[PDB]
Structure formats: C-alpha cells, structure tokens
Amino acid sequence: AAQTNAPWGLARISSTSPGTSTYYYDESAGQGSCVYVIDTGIEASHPEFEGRAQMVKTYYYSSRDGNGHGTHCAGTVGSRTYGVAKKTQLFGVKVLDDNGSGQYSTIIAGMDFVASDKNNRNCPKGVVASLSLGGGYSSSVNSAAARLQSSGVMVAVAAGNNNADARNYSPASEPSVCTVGASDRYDRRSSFSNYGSVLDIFGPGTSILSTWIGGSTRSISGTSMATPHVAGLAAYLMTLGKTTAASACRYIADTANKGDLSNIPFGTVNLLAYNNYQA
Ligand SMILES: [Ca+2]
Ligand SMILES: [Ca+2]
Numbered sequence: 001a002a003q004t005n006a007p008w009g010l011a012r013i014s015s016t017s018p019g020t021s022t023y024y025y026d027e028s029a030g031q032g033s034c035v036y037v038i039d040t041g042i043e044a045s046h047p048e049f050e051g052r053a054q055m056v057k058t059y060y061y062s063s064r065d066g067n068g069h070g071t072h073c074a075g076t077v078g079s080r081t082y083g084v085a086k087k088t089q090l091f092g093v094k095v096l097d098d099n100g101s102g103q104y105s106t107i108i109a110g111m112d113f114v115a116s117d118k119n120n121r122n123c124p125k126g127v128v129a130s131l132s133l134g135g136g137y138s139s140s141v142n143s144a145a146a147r148l149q150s151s152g153v154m155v156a157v158a159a160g161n162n163n164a165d166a167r168n169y170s171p172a173s174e175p176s177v178c179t180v181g182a183s184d185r186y187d188r189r190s191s192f193s194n195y196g197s198v199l200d201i202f203g204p205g206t207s208i209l210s211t212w213i214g215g216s217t218r219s220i221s222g223t224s225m226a227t228p229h230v231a232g233l234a235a236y237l238m239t240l241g242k243t244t245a246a247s248a249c250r251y252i253a254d255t256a257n258k259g260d261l262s263n264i265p266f267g268t269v270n271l272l273a274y275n276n277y278q279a
Contacts, residue, residue, distance in 0.1 A: 001025055001027040002025075005021055006081075008204065009204030009226075010082070010083075011023050012272075013229060013233060013272075013274060016257055017260075019185075025084075025086075026236070026277055028240060030078060030086070030087050030088035031087040032125035033236075034128065035077045035078060035130055035232065036128070036129045036130070037070055037090060037092055038129060038132075039093070039095070039096060039132050040065050040098065041065035041070045041094035042055060043071045043214075045215075046213075046215055048079040048082065052078065052088065052089055053089075056092060057094065059095055059109065065098075066213070067096070067098045067100050068213040070094065070096070071211050072210045072212055074092065075217075075228075076225060076229055079211050084232025084235075088232065088236075089121070091121070093113060104170075107141065111144045114129055114153060115148050126154065126234075126248075127245060128238070129148055129156065130156050130228045130231035133157075134158050134170065135170065136170065137167075137168050138170040138171075141170040142170050143174075145171035149245075154178065154234045154238070154245040154248040155171075155178060156227050156234065156249070157178065159198075159199055159223045161190075161192040161223050162192070163191065163192055163193070165194065166179060166198050167198055169194065172194065177249070178230060179198050180227045180229075181194065181201070182221075182226040183204060183206070183272060184204075184205070185207065187272070188261065188262050188263045189202070189262070189263040192223070194223065195267075196268060197267055197268070200253055201252055201253055202261055202269075203225075203226030203227070204226055204229055205221060205223055208225035233252060233273050234248040253271050257273075258271060260272050
C-alpha cells in the first residue's frame, strides 16, 4: 500500500533516503494492535481517527483534549492521513491537563493503569504505549515505565527537547524502554533533541503535521512528535508478526537506517526508524 504526498515523517520511515513523499506500508496497517497514548487526551471524534480512537482514563475533570498535543500524537500513531499504523486501535490516557503539564504521581498512576487495562481490551497482535512527555530524573517514574514494559507493553518514550544528555530525564533515562530522539527532514538531528547512550532510535520530530483539536490539523516539533512515529511503527511491526512487545525496540534498532543522521554526538546511536517494507 502507498500513500502519496504523505507527511515527510511518514515518507521517511518507509525510505532509505531523505527527500521522498510516498509512505509505503503493508495494508495490514497495525490491524489487531493497540496503542495507549499517555498524553493530554485524544479528540476521539476527529474524522481522521475513523472511530478507532477512544478515551479510556482521565485524571482530570474531563476526558476532553483541551490542549491538542495528545490528539497530535494519537494522529501520528494511527490517523488515516498522518498515522504510521493506519488501522490500529488508539486508547487515550489523559495524564496531563489542558496546559500540557502534570504531576509525576499522576503520570505514574497513568502508567500503572495501562499495565492493567490492557487485560480488558482485545489486542491480539500486542499493546504499545506512546509517552510523549518528560521532566527531570525520577527513579519512581523510571521504575513505573519499567513496570509498564515488563507487563508486556512496548513503551516508547520521548528523549526530551533540552539539547542535553537524556540520562538526566525521566522516563527517558529508563534503559528498559524505547527512548526516541528527533530528526528533521534533512536527516539532521533535531536541534532540540536530547542525545546520549540511553537513546535507542531516532524518528521524524521536526515539523510533523498531524491531527489537532476541533477536527483540524497543524504541524509542530519536538521529540514528543518522533515518539508516536516509533510507537506506531512498533504496532505496525507487531501486527505483521515480525516482533513482540518485549523485543520491538531492539528489533526497530536492528532494522533501522544506520548512519544516515548528521549532528549525532559520539556515543549516541545513529539509527533512524525504518519499516523496511518491500512492495
Ligand atoms: Ca540512506
Ligand atoms: Ca532502551
């Protein structure tokens, strides 16, 4: 299956070179898999979700996404036009308020919810968690994400937008999960993206067009944009049966475009997420 004039991020994860515009992917498109978007909530009524997105838990007065960040990331995972796995199930866990901030104990509770809620859903191909958030280091937040990954969920988290080493940021510094850095359309590391040994993979992060609240679309930048790319890629690869939740991050690093990114500091992996699809 091919989508022409795809967002540059989708065309890049299906190509070995930059500057393409077609996103190639298997037509299974993540059918049978689930992705929890642990963010500001999802506007499930957005036409681009086709009724495949729903809110399952909120920690605030409403499950409505008043920010739009959670909808943008849910779009990059599995929206029709802006989504990697165009046929995946999207579950909205709202751990942040409409300003985009939240407490660690709420984010930790939101991660423990996913580890239990997945036993009530039908996701035979597997379950993925996209965590487009982060702050200072927290051993309890790190152990929370380690708990989520240990329960059988592919945990993709953002590396942070501090232009610094991601060892000082949680849950980015938790080694058991998938820590995703950001790159731009010219195969440079995004100027904001964090780096370091703890990073596992890079994804398209700068100027990512996806869904927004009010049924609209907009393009934004951040490592929180590259994380849904990898989370949607994991669901895509898990539906194809090529990997499991416990091994998806290592598999994505195994089959990634090696050495394609510039501005990669020494000690940081030079791997860019790549679906390796051959039509
Ligand atoms: Ca190349
Ligand atoms: Ca890791």
